[PDB]
Amino acid sequence: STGSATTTPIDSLDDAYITPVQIGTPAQTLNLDFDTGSSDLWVFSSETTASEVDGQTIYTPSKSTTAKLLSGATWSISYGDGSSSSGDVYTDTVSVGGLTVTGQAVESAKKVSSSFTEDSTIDGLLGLAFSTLNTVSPTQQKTFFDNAKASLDSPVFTADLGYHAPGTYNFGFIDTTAYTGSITYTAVSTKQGFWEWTSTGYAVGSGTFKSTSIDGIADTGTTLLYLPATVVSAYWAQVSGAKSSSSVGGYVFPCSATLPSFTFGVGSARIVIPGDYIDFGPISTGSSSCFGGIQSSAGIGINIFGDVALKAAFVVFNGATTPTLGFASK
Numbered sequence: 001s002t003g004s005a006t007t008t009p010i011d012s013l014d015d016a017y018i019t020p021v022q023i024g025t026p027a028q029t030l031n032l033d034f035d036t037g038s039s040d041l042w043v044f045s046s047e048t049t050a051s052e053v054d055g056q057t058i059y060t061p062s063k064s065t066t067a068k069l070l071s072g073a074t075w076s077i078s079y080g081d082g083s084s085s086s087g088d089v090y091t092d093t094v095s096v097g098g099l100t101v102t103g104q105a106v107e108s109a110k111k112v113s114s115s116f117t118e119d120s121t122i123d124g125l126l127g128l129a130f131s132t133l134n135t136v137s138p139t140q141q142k143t144f145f146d147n148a149k150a151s152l153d154s155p156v157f158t159a160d161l162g163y164h165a166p167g168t169y170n171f172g173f174i175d176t177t178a179y180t181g182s183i184t185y186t187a188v189s190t191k192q193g194f195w196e197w198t199s200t201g202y203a204v205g206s207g208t209f210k211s212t213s214i215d216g217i218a219d220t221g222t223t224l225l226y227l228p229a230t231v232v233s234a235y236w237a238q239v240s241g242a243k244s245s246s247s248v249g250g251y252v253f254p255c256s257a258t259l260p261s262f263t264f265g266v267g268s269a270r271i272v273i274p275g276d277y278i279d280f281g282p283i284s285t286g287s288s289s290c291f292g293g294i295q296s297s298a299g300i301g302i303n304i305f306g307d308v309a310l311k312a313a314f315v316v317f318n319g320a321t322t323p324t325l326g327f328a329s330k
């Protein structure tokens, strides 16, 4: 089998992407944030504290003839950025772009933190990292990909995120029309539960490529590109007037600037992020200070190849026995 679904930016800055997902019988369609940096499929629901719902579409398991309470199971997730959610668990039928999994764990939120409440466009998360990070207790549950994998034509999914435009998540096949040149594959460590790999270096603008190993994670659920402070300083040094602002929370730059591109290495290959992709707009409405899309990972403990990086590529998440990651230009 295969599946193919369109993923759409939630706003004009590509802060996140939402993908429609069918849950239950009859189908309840929710728009979920596909997240290769976490491993829980959780949703706003009829069980979510009323004051914590503000415009989201909710899953109502009592209206699904295929929903079953997973007795005794609870879940609780605290994301690196301080957001959180928790609740109980149903199994139900979940379909993405025509690919159906029966008995998928659908984690129903009883509580969500304010950042989730405030984003009316995101109805939940669909985790695509390794199932070892799944938070359901006392019996850990599998991700949608892990459940689907054996049935797929090939044990892979691909992320093709758009810049200020829709893109695609495919399951089970590689669309050879969706990229240019060749796909370069690179090793993955699953030791921390992530799609963790090592970039071979970087360049700023038309500058020389610096060969240096940068370990990090391919994380569709993170907006920005978080890299070591040395690398990030070298980038922003090429933008007149750029500075790191503790009050704003990272590097900002004059909105009148033209940003240089940023290149990252994948083996001997190179992925070029255009300068425009690194512009996250005014820090507040009407400001002439703009927020940068490349930021230091120093306070995080891991480098993160988030949407800013991934949207410059066609990315293959190869879930074979020894997983790998592939990147192509597009």
Ligand SMILES: N#Cc1c(N)n[nH]c1N1CCCC1
Residues within 6 Å of the ligand: 033, 035, 037, 038, 079, 080, 081, 082, 083, 125, 219, 220, 221, 222
């Ligand atoms: N922090 C964090 C994070 C990450 N590294 N990947 N996806 C994250 N999400 C937080 C909000 C929903 C998804």
Ligand SMILES: N#Cc1c(N)n[nH]c1N1CCCC1
Residues within 6 Å of the ligand: 232, 233, 234, 236, 237, 242, 243, 244, 245
């Ligand atoms: N201002 C500023 C600043 C800072 N506090 N740390 N790094 C900075 N930059 C790196 C090159 C551009 C400015």
